[PDB]
């Protein structure tokens, strides 16, 4: 509980500080990679793989809400690395709402399958 | 610098997690 209390403040601190075709191919390659993960090591390989794919996706206010609601379902090291990934995304918001909802909805059903 | 922000960021995050988790 205390460590969780130490992840949320750090997120809040971060938030306060902040205050074509070739891309569609990189979205599809990211899905094939997310699909190999689908049905500490067993979290660590999906969690390492999550980084090169979110970088490829999003190199190519509302997105922090969508990822924050995604994080509240994940919360409700294996949580702590998704929280550090969330903190980086509070400083670097990038993407488009419809696609970011589809990618995070595939996060919700991948988390409901690790469930 | 695109590649260095790309595979700099993730490939090290990879490196430590293989190390942490898989250790």
Author numbering:
A (entry chain A): 5 to 23, 352 to 371, 419 to 439, 465 to 480, 494 to 532
B (entry chain Z): 11 to 33
Structure paper excerpt:
All bacteria contain a protein called YidC that inserts proteins into the plasma membrane of bacterial cells. Furthermore, the region(s) of YidC mediating the interaction with the ribosome have not been identified, and the oligomeric state of YidC during co-translational translocation remains controversial. In the resulting model, the conserved membrane integrated core of YidC forms a helical bundle arranged like the vertices of a pentagon, in the order 4-5-3-2-6 (clockwise) when viewed from the cytoplasm.
Secondly, the presence of elongated structural features allowed us to dock our molecular model in a distinct orientation (cross correlation coefficient 0.865). Following placement of the YidC-core model, two prominent densities in the membrane region, one next to TM3 and one next to TM5, remained unaccounted for. To verify this, and to exclude that the density neighboring TM5 corresponds to the nascent chain, we reconstituted single cysteine mutants of YidC either in TM3 (M430C and P431C) or in TM5 (V500C and T503C) with RNCs of a single cysteine mutant of FOc(G23C), and exposed them to disulphide crosslinking. Indeed, mutation of residues Y370A and Y377A (contacting ribosomal RNA helix 59) and D488K (contacting ribosomal protein uL23) severely interfere with YidC activity thereby emphasizing their functional significance. Finally, it is notable that we observe only a single monomer of YidC bound to the active ribosome. While SecY is known to translocate hydrophilic nascent chains through its central aqueous channel and insert TM domains through a lateral gate, our model suggests that the YidC substrates are inserted at the protein-lipid interface.
